[PDB]
Amino acid sequence: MPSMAPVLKNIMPAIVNVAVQGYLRKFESIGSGVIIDPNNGVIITNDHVIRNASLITVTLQDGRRLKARLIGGDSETDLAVLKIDAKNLKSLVIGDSDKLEVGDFVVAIGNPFGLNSFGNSQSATFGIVSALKRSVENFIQTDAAIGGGNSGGALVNAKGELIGINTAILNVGIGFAIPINMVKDVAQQIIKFGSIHRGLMGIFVQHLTPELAQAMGYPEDFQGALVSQVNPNSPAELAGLKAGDIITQINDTKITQATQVKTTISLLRVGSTVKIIVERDNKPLTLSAVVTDIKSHEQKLQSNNPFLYGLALRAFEQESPPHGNVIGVQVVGASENSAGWRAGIRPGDIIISANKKPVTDVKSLQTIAQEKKKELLVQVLRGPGSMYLLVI
Amino acid sequence: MPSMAPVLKNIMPAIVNVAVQGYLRKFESIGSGVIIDPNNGVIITNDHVIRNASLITVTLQDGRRLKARLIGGDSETDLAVLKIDAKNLKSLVIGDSDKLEVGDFVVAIGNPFGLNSFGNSQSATFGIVSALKRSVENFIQTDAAIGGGNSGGALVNAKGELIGINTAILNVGIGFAIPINMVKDVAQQIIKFGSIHRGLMGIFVQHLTPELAQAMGYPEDFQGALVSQVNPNSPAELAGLKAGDIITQINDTKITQATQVKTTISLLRVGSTVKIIVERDNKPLTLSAVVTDIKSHEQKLQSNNPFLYGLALRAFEQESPPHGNVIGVQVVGASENSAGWRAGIRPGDIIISANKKPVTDVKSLQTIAQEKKKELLVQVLRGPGSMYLLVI
Amino acid sequence: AGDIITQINDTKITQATQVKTTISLLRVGSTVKIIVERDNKPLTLSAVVTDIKSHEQKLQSNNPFLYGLALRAFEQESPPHGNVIGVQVVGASENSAGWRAGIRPGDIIISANKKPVTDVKSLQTIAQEKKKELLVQVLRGPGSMYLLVI
């Protein structure tokens, strides 16, 4: 007689209750957690379960109510790692969430927002994987949900292995899970450093469909991640990556799915050399690239183009009463965080001279901006009036 | 390790996305579709998915976004057949939906109204058949639903065969499906003719319960469809069908269920001779009958009874101030679409003479109505007053 | 353009509004005789009313990827992309192959069948590469994406 009872009875102690008290006004909040290292008391829940906590208490199936410590959380991946100091703890076999398919049977273990606050008992619910993660697009999706779903709890496969960590967004009958492969890596890194310090690579990637594979000269079943854009002066550009490359391996991981790429890179730390294997018009190339600090990169960009950085510019000529024939460069956009904004330049402004010299096109503006001076004097037409501005 | 993953991976390409633009004000709308003939690009969705469309685009799992043509739809069965011109298409094995039982495991494949507009990925959800069709009464019913259910998508059995086509009426956790046997027949007929042209048979049928079987002199397990009424001058009457007959076979289909009968006959076309095998007080009889055009039949009825057609009549005698003793035939009802309504006759009218002659009962009225004349002069009492009317 | 219509078939044309009414009710397949003054010379033209769907069908497959698209040459510094050179999609008919593939007004086509796109003719020429698909790289705000127009 088949039943999930045997596997669940063994893994249930691994799931726990997570209770939080805090101020936002004082509030309560409860969710679930999973013990992923029994020897050191390391529990995973969602970041949103424990945000704003002054107090966090873990209740085990065995009855103990334990004071827990936050080792660190990561709001973007919605994960948080906790420590409790206690012995005789149980966990479960961790699995590989890259190996999941639509149609596999799963069980989600974790109380809904309403339920069994008081019993040391975690509700179980059964179903299949309905759709794989694809960044609702951001998670493993299931039809195993109860009460609008669980946060912090375990998603396990038919064997009892942990394949993800549940989460509850506000989809009737649909359950969501953060895949365990990603969870592992944010756990290690929060454990070692206390938080993820994301750096910059500058690679935008897209799902390689069979359609696109074939149109790009590869078989229908070919797998990889399509590079859709490589920014200028980005680490990916230094490394030789081009739009149209198909990424097939990063470091030790084979890429068969664009969603893979974006997770790996994310959780990788400024300083890391990264091996990227690429296919380009059917030739393999191995590029190497260094993750850099986002604020450093913005610095480079700024001190390289100190007066015009953050501005979108185009050539402009137009008879424009009351000014007569107006020739210049139109500021089409401007980041609030630019020397240009700070000096007063706004979108819609026409720059008609720089350092008292006439400006005809963008190039002509960029050249004068290269002049080794402390400041750029800029004359702008703005609708029917005009200002001189100083860009420092 | 059991899993629905292998069967679903093979049939998933058969399911598609259906996107529609139109005016009702412009609107969008998306549902799903199933490819039932890969060689000719023939897709099934629901009629309600594609109604009011000026544009219909099919997205395949492989990535192609394809312009689709409406070959025809049928709002009563809520089905619509589509063509796309494209090669390398996949379908699935079509199954027999007469063979389904409560308790069989099923998977419904198709995105809910909310979900994955953008991924070429169709959500899957798992369960059992909860109740068989019984015309909510009109469909196969399941506990495989997500997000309030899918329209246009596939319902498949444990083997991966298509057993129905999903539909979403506005029942939490309950999924509905239009059974595939019916779908097949409306597809062929929409393909050949562009739409279903329903004719008239005139057979009302009822579920034969064990209770009723026994009370009618057959074993508890006897199957068939109970004829509850046969209209006068109907094709079923010409063919010899009587109330109390138990239909057991129509053409090539054995009838074990009343719901069967009504579908078959429906989709059958004016002109078709139809074999009906019947049981009557335990003797088998084979009747033959011809489907006729509904408007022709109404014509026959009218030109046969040209002045009184569409009227409900009873004998009437009553002392009725201020009229004294009133003898006549009371019009108890009247169809707006009758020579009688058009002339002014209303329910509650007493017909007291016809062609200047007194009317005592219905029969007496019918006889004068048979007179070979261009018109019927009718004198009516209406409450306290009276009108002469001319029925043409 | 600048011809003056004085007659359509046997109806005589004295105002602009008659033209719509005389012609709208003419059936597909008809020969229509349009009589005109052009520089004070009378001419008589003959034209065949076509089916609307068939005409749009003809424009469509005669221009299979770019039909319905309003397009202009585009050069602009555009943080974070740097200097973006390409063809801006200014309008896109909701029934075009381009709209179907995913293109939207605002997008900048920066490459086609893997070559750089500079002016509108450069895109038109690449579009004529003898295929059943045009591969386009579009820049949309800070992102980018490959689409296949079919």
Side-chain angles (χ1 to χ4, degrees):
Chain A
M1 190 210 73
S3 178
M4 282 294 128
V7 312
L8 297 190
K9 194 211 304 234
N10 294 158
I11 79 219
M12 209 65 67
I15 322 308
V16 313
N17 212 61
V18 170
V20 174
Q21 301 138 76
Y23 303 91
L24 289 148
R25 287 203 198 83
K26 70 183 288 152
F27 74 98
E28 245 258 276
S29 153
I30 113 88
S32 291
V34 183
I35 286 151
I36 63 157
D37 186 339
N39 303 319
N40 303 123
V42 167
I43 292 160
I44 297 150
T45 181
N46 307 131
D47 192 65
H48 77 260
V49 162
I50 63 64
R51 277 209 288 275
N52 307 322
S54 38
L55 274 152
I56 316 176
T57 304
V58 167
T59 295
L60 303 187
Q61 184 196 226
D62 77 19
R64 289 176 276 172
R65 321 223 320 116
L66 291 161
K67 193 202 216 344
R69 291 199 301 110
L70 213 215
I71 300 310
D74 185 50
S75 62
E76 177 167 310
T77 57
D78 205 359
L79 291 169
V81 174
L82 295 180
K83 205 147 175 332
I84 54 176
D85 302 303
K87 307 185 163 71
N88 203 43
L89 250 27
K90 313 272 198 292
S91 187
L92 32 27
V93 354
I94 313 302
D96 180 6
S97 74
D98 290 323
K99 294 279 203 210
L100 275 179
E101 313 196 69
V102 167
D104 289 331
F105 295 114
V106 295
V107 172
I109 298 142
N111 287 325
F113 153 94
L115 266 265
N116 186 266
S117 313
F118 311 126
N120 306 253
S121 47
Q122 225 81 38
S123 296
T125 187
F126 168 97
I128 76 179
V129 177
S130 331
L132 299 180
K133 160 160 183 190
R134 267 296 249 84
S135 269
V136 323
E137 276 87 8
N138 210 27
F139 320 99
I140 296 166
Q141 164 185 317
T142 194
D143 64 7
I146 46 161
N150 174 260
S151 298
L155 216 222
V156 301
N157 60 23
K159 287 145 108 117
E161 308 171 335
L162 188 62
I163 61 51
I165 288 298
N166 307 137
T167 176
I169 90 200
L170 277 67
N171 306 305
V172 179
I174 304 177
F176 301 104
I178 301 165
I180 197 61
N181 291 188
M182 182 196 65
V183 168
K184 270 174 147 172
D185 299 349
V186 359
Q188 173 191 253
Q189 153 154 201
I190 296 171
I191 280 180
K192 205 177 157 87
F193 303 101
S195 66
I196 287 68
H197 188 68
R198 275 165 189 99
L200 158 73
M201 246 286 142
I203 303 175
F204 283 41
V205 93
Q206 93 186 77
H207 186 234
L208 185 76
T209 58
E211 191 184 33
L212 254 1
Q214 279 169 313
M216 292 181 72
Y218 301 89
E220 59 175 20
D221 56 344
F222 192 82
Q223 304 174 297
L226 182 48
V227 172
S228 51
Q229 115 175 355
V230 183
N231 302 126
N233 306 303
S234 72
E237 182 188 272
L238 216 186
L241 200 66
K242 292 188 194 303
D245 290 353
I246 292 161
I247 295 165
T248 56
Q249 206 188 126
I250 294 179
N251 293 331
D252 280 335
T253 343
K254 238 309 287 157
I255 310 307
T256 65
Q257 267 179 12
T259 46
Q260 284 181 305
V261 162
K262 293 179 74 183
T263 82
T264 300
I265 281 157
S266 300
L267 295 358
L268 220 41
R269 280 187 91 83
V270 333
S272 323
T273 280
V274 5
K275 213 212 318 83
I276 306 155
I277 300 187
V278 123
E279 192 108 357
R280 177 184 302 167
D281 305 323
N282 273 281
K283 275 66 205 159
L285 306 170
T286 314
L287 313 166
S288 174
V290 173
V291 184
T292 64
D293 184 288
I294 290 156
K295 282 159 174 215
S296 303
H297 178 260
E298 225 55 44
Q299 284 283 167
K300 181 217 280 163
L301 271 33
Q302 288 164 312
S303 80
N304 139 337
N305 186 13
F307 307 132
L308 311 178
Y309 169 85
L311 294 182
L313 299 169
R314 37 164 271 192
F316 185 92
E317 184 173 359
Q318 160 170 323
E319 199 88 20
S320 283
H323 303 280
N325 198 19
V326 181
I327 305 185
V329 355
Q330 178 188 44
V331 176
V332 171
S335 166
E336 331 207 276
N337 181 209
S338 68
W341 182 282
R342 286 188 267 95
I345 286 162
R346 303 286 179 271
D349 282 347
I350 310 301
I351 299 177
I352 73 181
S353 69
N355 289 334
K356 302 221 73 181
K357 308 169 193 192
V359 159
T360 37
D361 63 307
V362 172
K363 227 168 155 181
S364 69
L365 176 58
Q366 289 163 323
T367 306
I368 301 139
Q370 289 312 122
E371 290 171 18
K372 307 284 150 154
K373 292 190 70 225
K374 47 202 285 146
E375 63 202 14
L376 216 223
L377 183 74
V378 159
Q379 182 188 1
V380 309
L381 294 57
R382 181 173 309 158
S386 281
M387 262 214 142
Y388 284 97
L389 275 14
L390 265 155
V391 190
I392 46 172
Chain B
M1 190 210 73
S3 178
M4 282 294 128
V7 312
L8 297 190
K9 194 211 304 234
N10 294 158
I11 79 219
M12 209 65 67
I15 322 308
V16 313
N17 212 61
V18 170
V20 174
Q21 301 138 76
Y23 303 91
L24 289 148
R25 287 203 198 83
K26 70 183 288 152
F27 74 98
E28 245 258 276
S29 153
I30 113 88
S32 291
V34 183
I35 286 151
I36 63 157
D37 186 339
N39 303 319
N40 303 123
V42 167
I43 292 160
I44 297 150
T45 181
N46 307 131
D47 192 65
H48 77 260
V49 162
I50 63 64
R51 277 209 288 275
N52 307 322
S54 38
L55 274 152
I56 316 176
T57 304
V58 167
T59 295
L60 303 187
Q61 184 196 226
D62 77 19
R64 289 176 276 172
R65 321 223 320 116
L66 291 161
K67 193 202 216 344
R69 291 199 301 110
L70 213 215
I71 300 310
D74 185 50
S75 62
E76 177 167 310
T77 57
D78 205 359
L79 291 169
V81 174
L82 295 180
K83 205 147 175 332
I84 54 176
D85 302 303
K87 307 185 163 71
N88 203 43
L89 250 27
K90 313 272 198 292
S91 187
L92 32 27
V93 354
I94 313 302
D96 180 6
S97 74
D98 290 323
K99 294 279 203 210
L100 275 179
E101 313 196 69
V102 167
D104 289 331
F105 295 114
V106 295
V107 172
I109 298 142
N111 287 325
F113 153 94
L115 266 265
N116 186 266
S117 313
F118 311 126
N120 306 253
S121 47
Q122 225 81 38
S123 296
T125 187
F126 168 97
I128 77 179
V129 177
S130 331
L132 299 180
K133 160 160 183 190
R134 267 296 249 84
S135 269
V136 323
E137 276 87 8
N138 210 27
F139 320 99
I140 296 166
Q141 164 185 317
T142 194
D143 64 7
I146 46 161
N150 174 260
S151 298
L155 216 222
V156 301
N157 60 23
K159 287 145 108 117
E161 308 171 335
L162 188 62
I163 61 51
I165 288 298
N166 307 137
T167 176
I169 90 200
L170 277 67
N171 306 305
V172 179
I174 304 177
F176 301 104
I178 301 165
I180 197 61
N181 291 188
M182 182 196 65
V183 168
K184 270 174 147 172
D185 299 349
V186 359
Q188 173 191 253
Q189 153 154 201
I190 296 171
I191 280 180
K192 205 177 157 87
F193 303 101
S195 66
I196 287 68
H197 188 68
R198 275 165 189 99
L200 158 73
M201 246 286 142
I203 303 175
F204 283 41
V205 93
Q206 93 186 77
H207 186 234
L208 185 76
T209 58
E211 191 184 33
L212 254 1
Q214 279 169 313
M216 292 181 72
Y218 301 89
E220 59 175 20
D221 56 344
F222 192 82
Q223 304 174 297
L226 182 48
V227 172
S228 51
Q229 115 175 355
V230 183
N231 302 126
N233 306 303
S234 72
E237 182 188 272
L238 216 186
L241 200 66
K242 292 188 194 303
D245 290 353
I246 292 161
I247 295 165
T248 56
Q249 206 188 126
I250 295 179
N251 293 331
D252 280 335
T253 343
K254 238 309 287 157
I255 310 307
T256 65
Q257 267 179 12
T259 46
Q260 284 181 305
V261 162
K262 293 179 74 183
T263 82
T264 300
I265 281 157
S266 300
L267 295 358
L268 220 40
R269 280 187 91 83
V270 333
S272 323
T273 280
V274 5
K275 213 212 318 83
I276 306 155
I277 300 187
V278 123
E279 192 108 357
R280 177 184 302 167
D281 305 323
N282 273 281
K283 275 66 205 159
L285 306 170
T286 314
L287 313 166
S288 174
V290 173
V291 184
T292 64
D293 184 288
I294 290 156
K295 282 159 174 215
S296 303
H297 178 260
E298 225 55 44
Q299 284 283 167
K300 181 217 280 163
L301 271 33
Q302 288 164 312
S303 80
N304 139 337
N305 186 13
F307 307 132
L308 311 178
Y309 169 85
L311 294 182
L313 299 169
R314 37 164 271 192
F316 185 92
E317 184 173 359
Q318 160 170 323
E319 199 88 20
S320 283
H323 303 280
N325 198 19
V326 181
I327 305 185
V329 355
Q330 178 188 44
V331 176
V332 171
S335 166
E336 331 207 276
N337 181 209
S338 68
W341 182 282
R342 286 188 267 95
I345 286 162
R346 303 286 179 271
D349 282 347
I350 310 301
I351 299 177
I352 73 181
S353 69
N355 289 334
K356 302 221 73 181
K357 308 169 193 192
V359 159
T360 37
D361 63 307
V362 172
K363 227 168 155 181
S364 69
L365 176 58
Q366 289 163 323
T367 306
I368 301 139
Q370 289 312 122
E371 290 171 18
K372 307 284 150 154
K373 292 190 70 225
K374 47 202 285 146
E375 63 202 14
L376 216 223
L377 183 74
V378 159
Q379 182 188 1
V380 309
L381 294 57
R382 181 173 309 158
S386 281
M387 262 214 142
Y388 284 97
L389 275 14
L390 265 155
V391 190
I392 46 172
Chain C
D3 284 343
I4 307 151
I5 290 174
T6 48
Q7 178 133 194
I8 304 209
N9 290 348
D10 292 300
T11 303
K12 171 89 177 103
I13 299 298
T14 67
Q15 358 155 223
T17 54
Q18 292 176 295
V19 175
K20 200 213 176 55
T21 74
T22 298
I23 284 170
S24 270
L25 294 2
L26 254 25
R27 276 198 96 67
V28 333
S30 289
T31 305
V32 66
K33 301 296 200 163
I34 301 167
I35 293 183
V36 134
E37 202 116 347
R38 176 180 297 173
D39 298 325
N40 322 279
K41 292 62 160 159
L43 288 164
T44 292
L45 307 176
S46 165
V48 189
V49 179
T50 63
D51 182 287
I52 296 153
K53 294 288 176 171
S54 308
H55 180 257
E56 230 70 9
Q57 208 293 281
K58 185 232 287 153
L59 261 31
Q60 258 175 320
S61 41
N62 170 184
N63 190 12
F65 313 117
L66 305 184
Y67 161 85
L69 294 188
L71 303 178
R72 81 171 185 93
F74 180 96
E75 178 158 10
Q76 166 180 307
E77 202 84 26
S78 293
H81 304 285
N83 196 22
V84 176
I85 298 177
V87 165
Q88 181 171 58
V89 168
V90 159
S93 186
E94 327 206 342
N95 76 142
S96 60
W99 180 281
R100 206 188 296 132
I103 298 169
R104 296 292 175 269
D107 294 345
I108 315 278
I109 296 160
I110 61 187
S111 78
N113 300 336
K114 318 222 83 165
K115 310 167 198 82
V117 157
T118 57
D119 56 3
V120 175
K121 265 165 73 159
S122 64
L123 175 67
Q124 284 159 331
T125 292
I126 289 143
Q128 310 199 269
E129 288 161 18
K130 266 265 134 190
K131 305 162 76 192
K132 86 168 192 311
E133 40 164 58
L134 174 67
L135 175 70
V136 179
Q137 189 191 9
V138 303
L139 202 156
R140 170 181 304 167
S144 257
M145 191 146 181
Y146 278 99
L147 310 306
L148 262 167
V149 185
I150 64 191

